[PDB]
Design a binder for this molecule. Structure first.
Ligand SMILES: [Fe+3]
Length: 321
């Protein structure tokens, strides 16, 4: 039906969560949500621009992508992180390494790297931009990936072209054709996957978000075996990310068509869904939770709510501050 917000999933597990979201909203007589299934942010971005879906949550890198032509989607609601007592609409891109090593951020040449994915904020845009000075990139037409592939001995950059940049997919753990996939079929995909790539010892550094280590390692003693590479070339505890990060970046956000995008219905849905199924709100459904073996389905597991984006704020403006 027309009045229902059509959400776009990028995997089957997300589709399954969306359908559960749909029946739960229906049970509590809240705003209706329907589900559309795709395989990547790009297919969801396109599907929305083509009125086949209405909304999707994207990392900063794809919020950028979605704002260009022929899509022109804009962020309508940002994820909120931190705590209810201290909420924030931004997180931190950090460089996590194993304690015991002596190399600093300016000494990564020849080492192995783990990234959340190609063109993702913390996993790529931020770290690569930060390391530019150390690369020997000759600018266009040479794709930046080529320079990165010459810098790190090997890496796992989900979504990178295994054909042109084999080095960038070498450390990835996906089976057969799924090796280096920009999806959960690749064990080292996204935040937790990139961190696992470090935990397993495949890589020497993981470019992820500051909350990853805390979500994945409950034991304080285990987390103490990791530290962060600070921009001033020093190492510090994973809990000191505020004084040791590569960048502070805007939170992932739900995007929608800039014209006739059902913005008000989308916000009504998010506000009520947050209230009914947000953190510690319901035993039957968790808008911000994912089943065992799954991470950040539809929204980050670390999200605690939403913040509506003021009108006439396009992708460009959202990301630039
Ligand atoms: Fe991100």
């Amino acid at each position: 039906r027309r009045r229902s917000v059509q959400w776009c999933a990028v995997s089957q597990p997300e589709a399954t969560k969306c359908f559960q979201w749909q029946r739960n909203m229906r049970r509590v007589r809240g705003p209706p949500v329907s589900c559309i299934k795709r395989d990547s942010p790009i297919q969801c971005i396109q599907a929305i621009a083509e009125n086949r879906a209405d909304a999707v949550t994207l990392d900063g890198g794809f919020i950028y992508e979605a704002g260009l032509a022929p899509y022109k989607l804009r962020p309508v609601a940002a994820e909120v992180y931190g705590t209810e007592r201290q909420p924030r609409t931004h997180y931190y891109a950090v460089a996590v390494v194993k304690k015991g090593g002596s190399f600093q951020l300016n000494e990564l040449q020849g080492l192995k790297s783990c990234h959340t994915g190609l063109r993702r904020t913390a996993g790529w845009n931020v770290p690569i931009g930060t390391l530019r000075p150390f690369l020997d990139w000759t600018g266009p037409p040479e794709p930046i990936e080529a320079a990165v592939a010459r810098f790190f001995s090997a890496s796992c950059v989900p979504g990178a072209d295994k054909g042109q940049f084999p080095n960038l997919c070498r450390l990835c753990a996906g089976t057969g054709e799924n090796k280096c996939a920009f999806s959960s079929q690749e064990p080292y995909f996204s935040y937790s996957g990139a961190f696992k790539c470090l935990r397993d010892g495949a890589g020497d550094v993981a470019f992820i978000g500051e909350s990853t280590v805390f979500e994945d390692l409950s034991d304080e003693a285990e987390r103490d075996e990791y530290e962060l590479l600070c921009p001033d070339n020093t190492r510090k505890p994973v809990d000191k990310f505020k004084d040791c990060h590569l960048a502070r970046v805007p939170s992932h956000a739900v995007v929608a068509r800039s014209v006739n995008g059902k913005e008000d219905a989308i916000w009504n849905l998010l506000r009520q869904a947050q209230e009914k199924f947000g953190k510690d709100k319901s035993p039957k459904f968790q808008l911000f939770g994912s089943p065992s073996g799954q991470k950040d389905l539809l929204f980050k597991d670390s999200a605690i709510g939403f913040s509506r984006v003021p009108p006439r704020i396009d992708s460009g403006l959202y990301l630039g501050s």
